[PDB]
């Protein structure tokens, strides 16, 4: 029996994302009109399991949580998905010490992984961010999350 | 591919109201923002303000008063900027550019990496 | 009265290295990212380098950049002819809320 495919989450599972030349988004609707850190071609790796793929050739609409499909939030007639996780989301420079800061930097509430995807081969994966501490883009950037309770 | 096209050159009066556009193709319109600067004969580059092709939102030069306002047409893909009440220091070639970042909060960074050829305008009698 | 000074003018022989330096007021670069910009005569400007380090794909190896401090510096290893332009460090600034440009630098193969 193969492992636990990357479609398969369950909360408190470690999620890692690699952002490839990532670009700085002013506003992004699935955080409220909030600024983001947003990849073309990112990366999910599940840490616990070591199953990872391309978000891109991900079917977002039958990735489950808990054994229950993803919660889809439709802004601007566009379909995106929300992967909760327990606390902040972490990330960095990729390879160097470097961090950036989530929006709500200074608030308990936690984050959770947003992907934009259309129906075939193009998915976008957004992660939270206050402003361009890490730069306007395009940059390598790294996360780390830990999988949070399903949303009701 | 990517491309700013800008209107033709203008010749007017002290006092009077100039309307330049911008049209940019190749691209999504409202994935980016959109600047404006401006560079006199003899001077470098004064950015003027920015315009968000998603949200029409805008930020302005303190430099002028009120004299400067940018709007928007997603429809028709171009940007449009105005400016009011002209003398002889408006003359200048003004650029229009895509923008990437924006910020303005304090870690910011942004940059302009698609130009348009500019239009030249003149402000004599 | 540019905010961000920039020597007027720099040379260098063919072939050989020329640093362009635009200091702050620790408002602008001390904080925030860092562009450069060069424009031939007549002509649009160009992007060179942004976030402070980093190169548009189609500029090559010899323009690099760094910022330190309250100041960033341009350099260019390798001084061809066809780089008689004009270059500018754009970033933005607190004080006066505005994207303020470097004042230029016009850099002669002589």
């Known amino acids: 029996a193969p492992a636990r495919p990357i479609t398969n989450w369950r909360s408190g599972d470690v999620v890692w994302v690699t952002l490839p030349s990532a670009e700085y988004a002013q506003s992004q609707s699935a955080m409220g009109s909030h600024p983001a850190y947003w990849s073309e071609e990112a990366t999910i790796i599940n840490v616990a399991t070591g199953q990872r793929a391309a978000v891109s050739s991900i079917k977002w609409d039958q990735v489950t949580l808990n054994g229950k499909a993803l919660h889809k939030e439709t802004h601007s007639g566009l379909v995106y998905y929300q992967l909760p996780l327990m606390g902040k989301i972490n990330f960095w420079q990729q390879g160097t010490t470097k961090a950036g800061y989530t929006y709500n930097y200074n608030t308990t509430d936690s984050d959770s992984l947003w992907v934009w995807w259309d129906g075939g081969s193009k998915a976008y994966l957004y992660i939270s961010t206050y402003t361009t501490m890490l730069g306007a883009g395009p940059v390598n950037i790294t996360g780390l999350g830990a999988v949070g309770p399903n949303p009701v | 591919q990517v491309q700013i096209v800008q209107s033709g050159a203008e010749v007017k009066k002290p006092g009077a109201s100039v309307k330049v556009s911008c049209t940019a193709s190749?691209?999504?319109?409202?994935?980016?923002?959109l600047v404006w600067v401006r560079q006199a004969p003899g001077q470098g580059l004064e950015w003027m303000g920015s315009?968000?092709?998603?949200?029409?939102?805008?930020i302005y030069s303190e430099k002028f008063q009120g004299r400067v306002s940018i709007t928007r047409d997603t429809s028709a893909s171009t940007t449009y900027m105005e400016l009011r009440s002209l003398r002889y220091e408006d003359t200048a070639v003004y650029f229009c550019?895509?923008?990437?970042?924006?910020?303005?909060?304090?870690?910011?960074?942004?940059?302009?990496?698609?130009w348009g050829n500019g239009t030249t305008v003149s402000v004599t009698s | 009265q540019s905010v961000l000074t920039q020597p007027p003018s720099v040379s260098a022989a063919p072939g050989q290295k020329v640093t362009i330096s635009c200091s702050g007021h620790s408002s602008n670069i001390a904080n925030n990212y860092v562009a450069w910009y060069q424009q031939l005569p007549g002509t649009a400007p160009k992007l060179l380098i942004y976030?402070?380090?980093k190169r548009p794909s189609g500029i090559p190896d010899r323009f690099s950049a760094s910022k330190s401090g309250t100041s960033a510096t341009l350099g260019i290893t390798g001084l061809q002819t066809g780089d008689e332009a004009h270059y500018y460090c754009?970033?933005?600034?607190?004080?006066?809320?505005?994207?303020?440009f470097g004042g230029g630098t016009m850099v002669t193969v002589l």
């Open positions: 754009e970033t933005w600034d607190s004080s006066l809320s505005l994207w303020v």
């Open positions: 315009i968000n092709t998603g949200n029409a939102n805008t």
């Open positions: 976030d402070n380090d």
């Open positions: 190749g691209y999504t319109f409202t994935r980016y923002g």
């Open positions: 550019a895509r923008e990437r970042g924006g910020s303005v909060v304090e870690p910011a960074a942004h940059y302009m990496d698609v």
